[PDB]
């Protein structure tokens, strides 16, 4: 159906991130990085893809979309950038 996407108002989830979402984002961007992707920020002479992904996610610079599965089977989408990585 896809009759199940809330628009970007009244989003009941957080404007933060979680540790688990953070983990999957870091791992997924790391999987691209170690799978020979175009990087977006400069290397600090760094071949350490976990540290590379942490450098990228320091400034909301990782091109991905999160699908938070709502608790009935519907979902919202989420930009990576509008979150707050405060922790």
């Amino acid at each position: 159906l896809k009759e199940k996407a809330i628009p970007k108002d009244q989003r009941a989830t957080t404007p933060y991130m979680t540790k688990y979402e953070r983990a999957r984002i870091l791992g997924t961007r790391a999987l691209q990085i170690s799978m020979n992707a175009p990087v977006f920020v400069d290397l600090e002479g760094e071949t350490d893809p976990l540290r590379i992904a942490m450098k990228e996610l320091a400034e909301k610079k990782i091109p991905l979309v999160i699908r938070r599965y709502l608790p009935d089977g519907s979902f919202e989408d989420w930009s990576v950038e509008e979150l707050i990585v405060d922790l």
Partner: protein, 1415 residues
């Protein structure tokens, strides 16, 4: 996996659907023509019998013809056979359902017996629940047993609504194994029920019959419930085994199939030819029995069919029932690759996230990383070094899944690494891996640490991570799992490393700390005497791995540079710290240096001990982790470890027998103290000889003597232990270890010096295994403590052999309890895990199961995490009325509630203003309504409570940053203080929907924390004592908002499994008025079964009066159960033939008293003087009770109480009266109540406390009476007037639910479980048990924690099946053909996907536009 990549579309599973075969479907599927019972190797040659295995079924290596599905042994699923069952046979597990469905049908037609002609059948067909619906229909169709053709409907009786006819009678069939006897029943008509007859009946049972019987005519066919074509598994299910040549050793299922096919030939040849109608009946039963014993061999056909050479059978119910079974052995966690297991060893020179791997593991543990241009030089250098060194390479996996095997060929320095390949490099440093020790018990039972390759093959760990692993260095073993993909490494490194785990969710404390040697060393070090020279300060300051290079100023420079080594410890502690403890009389002038004070890494005063650097509630490690974070905590451990390491290496700490021996005259005092203890036991024994012992209620004279002996003995033991402990001086090293808290206790030094004490077995002291004596060296009938198990001397002087035998018993008891409690706590652990496995917390902060059933609305009622929750105090809940008004009350229009202008710079102009006075009286009335609310919530009123982020810490952090000088008044605006309070009160977003349900939920959730926050950031607090600035206030509110919205619960934690493990840990630490606890209590509560071994309850007195003893005696007398056995000795039938004057001279006066119509049978009952003073029972009350309880055939006659025999004469009031009268007087003696309700056993009159708020403002520990009793009948003990029935308490939760409603039953379950766990002394968080208790009381009753309840709930099949009920519930879900949603953890474990939870609880999708944007 999967060479020759192809074009099939790929997905993951969403449907698990069950159901039964058609025989025609098996004929559609299979490619078999199975008739040869001879198996394989046609004429004993390496070739293919086409009857069994390979009629183009699966073949083995080097012989590939598998109907072109060759593929070797791998890469080819096998294919299925079939069986031409001529006579139809049963399916063995389905036979119970077959009986329960043949009770519902008229035979030879197929029609339902009982239809919508019946009102109860009509109302019971409305159940849209298949299993319980068929259960109710089976209960209705066991009622009437004859097909009724003309049926009266539910309108009127005289008209007869017809249906299908054929009014035959249904015979009562009772089960006999493979035989179901049909005895039609006048005329007992025992008939063997034909499989062909019931075949035709089920072939005639119809559409509405199935669907109204809860079954699926699409899938679930009870006429498919009968085996008539059986498919045959391939050799890729049943393999073959050789002795280097195929001589002996084929497979058991192969020979079962050859057996059943031989039995099939036996049934074949007697139907293909002549028919013995009493011996062709066994031509089937052989085939039926063999195909039935194939799938199951625990049947009531008790011949096991024990196969040859002593090995009985190999069947599929035995294959599938778990614990080395198929499901539980190969599907929920198996033996793995990329594995490493060795012994462990310690070192403190490594660090907290480091583990020392042996070099030869590093030569064989490896990692397949892809060819990367970022270190192509180093990776090609590794493959140039080769597989025969440390920095080498093992394989070069090519681009399409092709392993280059290096060393066995001739070119170990071969090809440059092509882009797209995978070099299988060995382990290098700083790839952190998984590292676990079995048993696994909690979140912390696995962790991750970086690699530091070493020689000398052990596994290292730092010595303060060996505490939460619960390992030790006795060679206890730990495993090593190396993660494999890039994102796997990312996941483990970003979550499962130790500094992320440090604060523990178990009971919200730190789980690590500082342990024995480092601990006692830091205990000796921070003593004030530890003066240090110059170059050693230089050496330790290099030893700290992150010195600032600053040589600190020496605190003593008088001539000479010295140091009070607390200061050089303070250079290890990083910045921004405070702590304060105030132990007993520590008011800033400590004559003991006990307590603490830290500023920013300057120890002001105090020793360092376990309650600072260990695992403690106000832990310094806790404060370090909260104020900075995990990596600063990780460096804290390294600093304190290596600093105290070097100081211990060049000071030393020893111990020995000099720490054990006390001084001479004090050992003399010890021995005379135990002598006066034996003087006390000698006096009370000689008082027992005179038998004058006032036994208090609860126990007899002997046990009332026993408790006094045990109490006086152990009281003397611990008094002598205190005498020893204060004898000893500072140089007692074991006393120094005691004040360290590394090992031992005051009891340990008491045992090693003063006396051993008291041995025991099973709670008692030593009882006579012989008669009258424990040992032949003792007299008979000794209740001296020396035979009853006292031991006189400590370990120093020794063991006389009687004491040695007592102590050998006291230790072997402990080995009994470990060797049984490991088994039962392991079962209770695995039961609680498999119960609460799937309860996660979803994005709207609500708690759900596998099937979307909502369990908790907000987790822990706030969404506050056990990974964060601290303990802070209240301030409002105490205080007097006038003191609290002086404390928080602000007014300018009064005398003393004014402010001082030394706090507020604008304190002059503020005066008298109502435009602020209304706000101040708003806030004060707000907090007084809050005070009433807190005393509504917490009845006692203790103040330390599990709450989130510490207000008190955060304002004192702002103090020690922004340099509050307490002389200048502050620039803070009072309206700004009140507005900031209000704005942050409306800021704590946990729920994020904008309507009234969500807003009421958010306010009601964080109500108590907001009460705390306003009680703290009240006006007189923030002015008078915290004294902030504008910048301090704004930074404080920014920090409260920041860390509160950081410490809100995230979504995705498997809070169920983590809750199960956190209640399953402290059950392990348990050991064993006499009311039980421990693993029997836990098993009685989780297995909720009714036969509980101590069902006690408690009542209180009337709420009017306080502690009135006469009235408490009245209540316990009015409740106290009283029968005639309790009051009688001599129940006598006489025959006094004169029923107007007694032939016994004791009772002359009484008949002419009574006459101021009978029998000559004198019926005499004695009462004793003991019982009618045990209860306040009047003889006239008793006689009138006998009167008003019989009232039919007896003339009641009393006696005199003032005369000391109490005789109940009776006769009979209108000869064969005694033959029934003896059973009648039995029924008098033991079947008639006299007081109270039944099950009112031993009633204990206790004077407990009553921690109440005062009628003047403060708290009061008040005295009252609270009774104790050990029965249960809650409805009847409740209704008795004279109690406090709003505050009654029982443990018996079944009666508590059925008397006071399911939610109160849940809450009493909770208080019961929490108190009987924390009676041990241990602690756990509220919320884990909260989740557990709610899943107990969610389905409506009290679901027992076993296979009686939740694993009999309506949830998913494959999630339900993995608690040892495999055949039963699998055949069940095949009978009802269920759809399992694949929304379950164990389901995705079984089927091999990502588990749909946590870091599997979302998707990740690539954006198209930001890809264009970021360049």
């Amino acid at each position: 996996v999967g060479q020759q990549y192809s074009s099939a579309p790929l997905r993951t599973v969403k449907e698990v659907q069950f159901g039964l075969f058609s025989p025609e479907e098996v004929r559609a599927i299979s490619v078999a023509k199975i008739r040869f019972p001879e198996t394989m190797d046609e004429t004993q040659t390496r070739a293919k019998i086409g009857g069994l295995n390979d009629p183009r079924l699966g073949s083995i290596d080097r012989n590939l013809k598998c109907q072109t599905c060759q593929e070797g042994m791998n890469e080819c699923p096998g294919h299925f056979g079939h069986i031409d069952l001529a006579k139809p046979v049963f399916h063995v597990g389905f036979i119970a359902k077959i009986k329960k469905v043949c009770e519902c049908v008229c035979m030879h037609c197929g029609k339902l017996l009982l239809d919508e002609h019946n009102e109860l059948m009509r109302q019971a067909l409305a159940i849209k629940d298949s299993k319980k619906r068929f259960a109710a229909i089976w209960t209705l169709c066991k009622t009437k047993m004859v097909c009724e053709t003309d049926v009266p409907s539910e309108d009127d009786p005289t008209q007869l609504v017809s249906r299908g006819g054929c009014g035959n009678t249904q015979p009562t069939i009772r089960k006999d194994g493979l035989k179901l006897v049909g005895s039609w029943k006048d005329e007992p008509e025992l008939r063997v029920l034909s499989t062909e007859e019931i075949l035709n009946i089920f072939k005639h049972i119809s559409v509405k019959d199935f669907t109204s019987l809860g079954f699926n005519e699409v899938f679930s066919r009870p006429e498919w419930m009968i085996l008539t074509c059986l498919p045959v598994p391939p050799p890729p299910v049943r393999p073959s085994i050789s002795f280097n040549e195929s001589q002996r050793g084929e497979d058991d299922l192969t020979f079962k199939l050859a057996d059943i096919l031989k039995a099939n030939i036996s049934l074949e040849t007697l139907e293909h030819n002549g028919a013995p109608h009493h011996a062709i009946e066994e031509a089937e039963s052989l085939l039926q029995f063999h195909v039935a014993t194939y799938m199951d061999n625990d049947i009531a056909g008790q011949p096991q069919a024990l196969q040859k050479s002593g090995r009985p059978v190999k069947s599929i119910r035995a294959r599938l029932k778990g614990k080395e079974g198929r499901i539980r052995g190969n599907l929920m966690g198996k033996r793995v690759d990329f594995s490493a297991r060795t012994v462990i060893s310690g070192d403190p020179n490594l660090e907290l996230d480091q583990v020392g791997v042996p070099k030869s593991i590093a030569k064989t543990l490896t990692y397949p990383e892809v060819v990367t241009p970022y270190n192509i030089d180093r990776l090609t250098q590794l493959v140039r070094n080769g597989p025969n060194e440390h920095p080498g390479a093992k394989y070069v996996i090519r681009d399409s899944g092709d392993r280059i095997d290096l060393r066995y060929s001739k070119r170990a320095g071969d090809i440059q690494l092509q882009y797209g390949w995978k070099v299988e490099r060995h382990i290098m440093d700083n790839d952190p891996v998984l590292f676990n020790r079995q048993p696994s018990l909690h979140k912390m039972s696995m962790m991750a640490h970086r690699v530091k390759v070493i020689p000398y093959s052990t596994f290292r760990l730092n010595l303060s991570v060996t505490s939460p692993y619960n390992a030790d260095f006795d060679g206890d073993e730990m495993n090593l799992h190396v993660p494999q993909s890039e994102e796997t490494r990312a996941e483990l490194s970003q979550l499962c490393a130790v500094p992320l785990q440090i604060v523990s969710p178990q009971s919200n404390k730190p789980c690590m700390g500082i342990v024995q040697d480092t601990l006692c060393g830091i205990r000796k070090l921070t003593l004030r005497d530890t003066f240090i020279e110059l170059d050693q300060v230089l050496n330790m300051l290099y030893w700290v791995p992150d010195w600032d290079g600053v040589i600190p100023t020496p605190a003593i420079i008088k001539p000479k540079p010295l140091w009070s080594g607390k200061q050089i410890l303070s250079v290890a502690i990083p910045n921004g710290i405070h702590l304060q403890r105030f132990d007993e009389g520590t008011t800033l002038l400590s004559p003991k240096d006990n307590g603490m004070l830290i500023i920013d890494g300057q120890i002001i005063f105090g020793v360092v001990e376990k309650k600072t650097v260990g695992s403690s509630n106000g832990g310094l490690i806790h404060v370090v982790t909260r104020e900075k974070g995990p990596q600063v905590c990780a460096k804290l451990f390294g600093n304190i470890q290596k600093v105290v390491n070097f100081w211990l290496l060049h000071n030393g700490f020893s111990t020995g027998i000099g720490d054990t021996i006390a001084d001479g005259p004090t050992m003399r005092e010890i021995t005379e103290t135990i002598a006066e203890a034996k003087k006390k036991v000698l006096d009370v024994t000689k008082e027992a000889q005179a038998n004058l012992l006032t036994a208090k209620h609860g126990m007899t004279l002997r046990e009332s003597f026993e408790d006094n002996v045990v109490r006086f003995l152990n009281e003397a033991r611990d008094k002598a232990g205190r005498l020893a402990e204060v004898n000893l001086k500072d140089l007692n090293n074991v006393k120094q270890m005691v004040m360290a808290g590394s090992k031992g206790s005051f009891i340990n030094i008491a045992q090693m010096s003063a006396c051993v004490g008291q041995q025991s077995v099973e709670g008692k002291r030593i009882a006579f295994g012989f008669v009258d004596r424990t040992l032949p060296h003792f007299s008979k009938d000794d209740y001296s403590p020396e035979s009853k198990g006292f031991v006189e001397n400590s370990y120093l002087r020794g063991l006389t052999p009687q004491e040695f035998f007592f102590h050998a018993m006291g230790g072997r008891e402990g080995l009994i309890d470990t060797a049984v409690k490991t088994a039962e706590t392991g079962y209770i652990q695995r039961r609680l895990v498999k119960a609460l496995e799937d309860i996660m917390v979803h994005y709207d902060n609500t708690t759900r199961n596998s099937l979307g059933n909502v369990i908790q609305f907000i987790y822990g009622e706030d969404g506050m995490d056990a990974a964060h929750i601290e303990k802070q105090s209240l301030d409002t809940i105490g205080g007097s009325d006038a003191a609290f008004e002086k404390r928080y009350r602000v007014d300018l229009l009064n005398t003393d509630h004014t402010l001082d202008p030394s706090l507020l710079e604008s304190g002059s102009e503020i005066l008298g203003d109502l435009k602020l006075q209304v706000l101040l009286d708003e806030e004060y009335k707000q907090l007084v309504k809050d005070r009433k609310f807190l005393r509504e919530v917490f009845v006692d009123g203790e103040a330390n409570w599990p709450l989130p982020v510490n207000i008190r810490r955060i304002i004192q952090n702002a103090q020690q940053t922004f340099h509050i000088d307490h002389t200048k008044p502050s620039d803070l605006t009072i309206k700004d203080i009140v507005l900031g309070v209000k704005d942050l009160q409306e800021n704590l977003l946990v729920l994020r929907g904008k309507n009234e349900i969500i807003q009421n939920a958010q306010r009601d959730a964080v109500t108590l924390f907001c009460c705390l926050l306003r009680s703290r950031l009240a006006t007189r607090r923030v002015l008078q004592e915290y004294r902030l600035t504008k910048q301090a206030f704004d930074w404080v509110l920014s920090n409260i908002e920041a860390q509160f919205l950081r410490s809100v619960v995230h979504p995705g934690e498997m809070v169920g499994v983590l809750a199960a493990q956190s209640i399953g840990e402290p059950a392990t630490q348990m050991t064993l008025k006499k009311v039980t606890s421990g693993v029997p209590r836990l098993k009685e509560i989780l297995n909720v079964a009714k036969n509980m071994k101590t069902p006690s309850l408690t009542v209180y007195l009337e709420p009017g009066h306080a502690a009135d003893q006469e009235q408490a005696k009245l209540i316990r007398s009015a409740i106290e159960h009283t029968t005639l056995k309790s009051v009688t000795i001599a129940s006598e039938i006489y025959y006094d033939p004169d029923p107007r004057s007694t032939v016994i001279p004791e009772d002359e006066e009484i008949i002419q008293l009574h006459f101021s119509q009978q029998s000559p049978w004198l019926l005499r009952l004695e009462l004793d003087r003991a019982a009618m003073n045990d209860k306040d029972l009047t003889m006239g009350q008793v006689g009138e009770r006998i009167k008003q309880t019989f009232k039919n055939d007896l003339f009641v006659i009393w006696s005199e109480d003032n005369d000391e025999k109490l005789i109940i004469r009776c006769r009979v009031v209108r000869a064969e009266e005694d033959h029934m009268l003896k059973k009648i007087e039995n029924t008098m003696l033991e079947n008639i109540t006299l007081r109270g309700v039944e099950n009112i056993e031993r009633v204990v009159m206790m004077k407990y406390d009553r921690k109440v708020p005062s009628p003047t403002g403060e708290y009061v520990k008040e005295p009252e009476w609270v009774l104790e009793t050990d029965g249960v009948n809650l409805s009847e003990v409740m209704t008795v007037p004279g109690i406090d029935p709003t505050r009654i308490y029982t443990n018996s939760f079944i009666d508590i639910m059925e008397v006071l409603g399911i939610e109160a039953g849940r809450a009493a379950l909770y208080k019961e479980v929490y108190n009987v766990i924390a009676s041990d002394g241990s602690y756990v968080n509220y919320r884990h048990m909260a989740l557990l208790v709610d899943v107990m009381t969610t389905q409506g009753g009290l679901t027992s924690v076993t296979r009686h309840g939740f694993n009999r709930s309506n949830t998913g099949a494959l999630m339900r099946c993995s608690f040892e009920e495999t055949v039963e519930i699998l055949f069940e879900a095949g009978a009802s053909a269920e759809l399992d949603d694949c929304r379950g953890v164990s389901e995705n474990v079984i089927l091999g996907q990502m588990a749909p939870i946590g870091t599997g609880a979302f998707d990740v999708m690539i954006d198209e536009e930001s890809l264009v944007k970021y360049m």
